[model samples]
Target: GNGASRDWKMAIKRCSNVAVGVGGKSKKFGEGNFRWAIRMANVSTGREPGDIPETLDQLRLVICDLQERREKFGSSKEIDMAIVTLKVFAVAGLLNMTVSTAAAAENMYSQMGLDTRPSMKEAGGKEEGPPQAY
Candidate 1:
């Protein structure tokens, strides 16, 4: 119960196309990709991957911000990573959910991390330092 990531791993495999490849060889590919996407989703949404919200609206807000972040980033790698996170939400039916208010979204985002603060600049900070294994 303590490790939030366990829930997300199961959700990703169950709800996502991540298993299409898993039905065959290269379990490493699907597993590693899930981990990468989960991490990116966490960093992108300013929340733990296991902390995935219950309602569609909550997840939708993260997708919307990630879409906006694509424009803010303006790079192939960053844009691609953003799309990866977006795809996970889509496969999970999160994008089809209703939208939440700006006030509520901001409140949730702030609570995810103490220094949420928009996160546009910080997104670039971590990726710049380490060549994150995908």
Candidate 2:
């Protein structure tokens, strides 16, 4: 699986949301928005220490909402193209699952190809490019 992404962190980053041309963000793929949203869910207000198991369930609901966004599990030319592209070089061989750390996952995912280096003072690279369509 040399050519394939070695982990889901890479996959997650590749699947994250893109701030289309500095205007609005699009969930063309749900993974990134899925993640960013969850991590910062109660950021400003804080996840009250009082939040217990109930917080866990609410968090679960949040994830469910995020997942519903990008995965109609469609064959849209966009997703279909990627499925086709990756599948061409992908190996459906194992049951391996996961990445090591969240920071690493986020750092590794900072940029996917298009311009990992944010113009205004940056240092990085990407594994994937900005969205493309068929």
Candidate 3:
């Protein structure tokens, strides 16, 4: 199981590789890394253009990676919110499976008070500081 362990380690490494003090210590999303890896996987597997299963599999891998990272670094409200928004776009992409999975993810995050809806952010802001003195 070293390969799995190594991959988990690498995923954590990638998560923590975000530059210190930038974006408030959040992990780097490594979009390019994800994109290139998926592209290569698709090519190697001989997947044709507009292959829904292949695309959905790629997205599922990404979400799985993110879930592992969240477990390691504690859950992230920001990331959860971003995921919810992304899921909306996934629906637009005609990926119903992803949409359903995203809804489940959103619910889990919601239970943890990690929902990042705009109204939640506004409420958090109000609790943090009064309207700017200016």
Give the number of the best model, judged by lDDT. Answer: 1
Instruction: Score candidate 3 by lDDT.
Output: 0.40
Which ranking of candidates, highest TM-score first? Answer: 1, 3, 2
What is the Cα root-mean-square deviation between model 1 and the actual structure? 14.2
Measured on C-alpha atoms, candidate 2 has an lDDT of 0.32
**CA error at residue 128 for candidate 3, angstroms:** 20
Local accuracy by lDDT, each model: 0.45, 0.32, 0.40
* Model 1 C-alpha lDDT versus the unseen true structure: 0.45
For model 1, what is the alpha-carbon lDDT of residue 15? 39
Q: Which structure is stronger by TM-score: 2 or 3?
A: 3
- Clash pairs detected, candidate 3: none
Residue 49 lDDT (model 2) = 51
Q: How much does candidate 3 score in TM-score?
A: 0.31
Per-residue lDDT of candidate 3, residues 2-102 (tens digit): 45445433533433232222223343334354344444434434466764232545655444555455557776665454444333333323222222233
**Per-model TM-score versus the true fold:** 0.41, 0.20, 0.31
Give the range of the ten consecutive residues with the poorest summed lDDT in model 3. Answer: 117-126
Off by over 4 Å in 3: 1-54, 96-134
RMSD of each: 14.2, 17.1, 13.8
Candidate 2 residues 15-44, lDDT tens each?
332221212233233453433443443332
Question: Candidate 2: RMSD over Cα atoms?
Answer: 17.1
